[PDB]
Amino acid sequence: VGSLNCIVAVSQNMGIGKNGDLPWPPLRNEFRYFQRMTTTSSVEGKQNLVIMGKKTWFSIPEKNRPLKGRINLVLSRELKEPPQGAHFLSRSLDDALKLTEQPELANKVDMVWIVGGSSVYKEAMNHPGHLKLFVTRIMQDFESDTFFPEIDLEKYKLLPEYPGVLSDVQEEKGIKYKFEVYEKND
Template sequence: MSRVLNAIVAMCPDLGIGRDGHLPWHPIRLKDEFKYFQKMTATASVEGKQNVVVMGKKTWFSIPEKNRPLNNRINIVLSRQMKVPPAGAHHLAPDFCSALKLIDTELSEQADQVWVIGGSSLYKELMQSQGTRRLFVTQVLEQFQCDTFFPEFCPDEYHLLPGFPGVPQGLQEENGIQYRFEVYESVVHCPLYSK
């Protein structure tokens, strides 16, 4: 059975996920939303194993240096140009397929869940991959200016789960910004993304 692949993202109504290398609502901080990200990506389901966070190079460098690598997780950075992992990163892979191969071979004894945390092109690769994918989406209900966007996803391919363990229900609000947590799941390959 193939591994479930998870993506976690916070987005504006227009699917915007970033601006100038920051979250769209920067400098406003959504501390509870960030704690949710930490909890979901760091909590392994198998004792003695660690979750893996996979990210593009820009996402890695958008994390404040003092927070790199993300604690209690195996950090894999993707880059076709870099020859060695950036300082602090645990592993470097040239692309998403290579990262998955690394997880299933060299890291198979220690890796639990796989979480894609950005950026845009990596989310798209995950959505084009086969098998079960889960999208953990924080729907921010206010529009901010964005220059980076989450790929559109096929509504026929993903269904909204009515509830998911560890995911708070209902409307949340911090610093005057409202948002809700949603989890979508897919098991079918979307014709929109077929090669």
């Protein structure tokens, strides 16, 4: 199995969600960036795995689930089987990561991408080890009811460039945003 990574888009006031949806209007190139980054595997014969909480799964429109070309794993302690369209179900983040190591999957998974939401991000970010955060900074405040955990900049180094990631300011629907990549190793 290769790297562990989180990916997220976040407003200036650290918001990621409101009422089961994004706080901002759809940003279609932002979403194409998310798709490209999480689908692209730097290893032949393998695909990437995406891990998400239950609410995130149901927050993605039906037409776009499962996220295609990736193994989709949902986290829940209530569900008895993966949701309609998903591939795997685990009861903790530790369980999900062990599973990638099992022979069912050890040979098939390249990168792992945590794609939401708050609890899953927090636990990954505070777990010792090598971890990258792909963060899109939406450069406006948006009313939100769900927030991204604090990034400790003592541990997470902002990378000065990263292959495949544009460094300049993007804009769609009059909303400016920029891409960042952070890395810790502890």
